[PDB]
């Protein structure tokens, strides 16, 4: 659904770094913490919150900050890495505020991203 994923459907080979931004859209009165982790290519998904903490991660607090960013290092070659979101604490809220919020994720590429070997791939989008 991203524009990066649609433009690299016209090419064959690519390599570079990425960046993912998370945006918390709950109310002003809600607090809590999260754990966003990244696993390099080759290793599996972690089994629990404790082994994911032993690795590349960040703690994200709702009450202090509404946006966090995660720089993914080099992806390449047309397995892959994994990004997982865990609950550190529970979701704390006062009386009179809603119990459920949502997160919106935004993704782009860095300045060292390249593409090569063009290919007009046969899209599903057919004319009429």
């Amino acid at each position: 659904s991203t524009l990066l994923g649609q433009l690299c459907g016209y090419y064959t080979q690519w390599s570079g770094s990425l960046e993912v931004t998370f945006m918390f859209t709950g109310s002003f009165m809600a607090t809590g913490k999260m754990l966003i982790a990244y696993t390099p290519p080759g290793g599996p998904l972690p089994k629990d919150r404790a082994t994911a903490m032993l690795g590349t991660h960040v703690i994200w607090d709702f009450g202090l900050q509404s946006s966090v960013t995660l720089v993914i290092p080099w992806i390449s070659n047309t397995t892959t890495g994994l990004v997982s979101i865990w609950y550190q604490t529970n979701y704390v809220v006062p009386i009179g505020a809603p119990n459920t919020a949502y997160i919106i994720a935004l993704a782009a590429a860095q300045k060292n991203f390249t593409m090569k070997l063009c290919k007009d791939a046969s899209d599903i989008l057919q004319t009429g």
């Binding site: 404790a50 903490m53 032993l54 550190q88 604490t89 529970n90 809220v93 009386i95 009179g96």
Partner: protein, 175 residues
Amino acid sequence: IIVGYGEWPSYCVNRFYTLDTKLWEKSSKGWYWKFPDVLTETGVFGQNAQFHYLYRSGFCIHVQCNASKFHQGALLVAVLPEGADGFELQHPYVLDAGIPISQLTVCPHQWINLRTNNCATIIVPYINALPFDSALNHCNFGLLVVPISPLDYDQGATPVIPITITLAPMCSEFA
């Protein structure tokens, strides 16, 4: 920031270890952790603790909690010399040792009042009658988190308040 006994860690695994989250209710007694026993199973520090013969390290401890403006309560965080999910106090008035809790402020301590702050920080140097000991046979100190004034809220708010401990080893040796 509290620097324990006016002294920094010094020479005679440099990352944050967020342990786990405790749940503070209206009927909690208190909790304690024993160091370095809390960390001899996780990560690179847990390997070098049980593969070497001598040990010397200082610490830096952060205690945090998050709540709304409709909650109330107070915690006393203290460090007293001599697993990773802690134990619960049975008799918090005598600290399970026959000594009163009202005199625990003679130790390196810090208050957490939910009306005012939400974080505590204590720096602990290396304390022993020897220059080097064993990490697996001798625990140096313990960390105490006791609610002096109990938690309260009105019905409909979140009944359970998170407490997270995160720590960082500082000036460690292994021999």
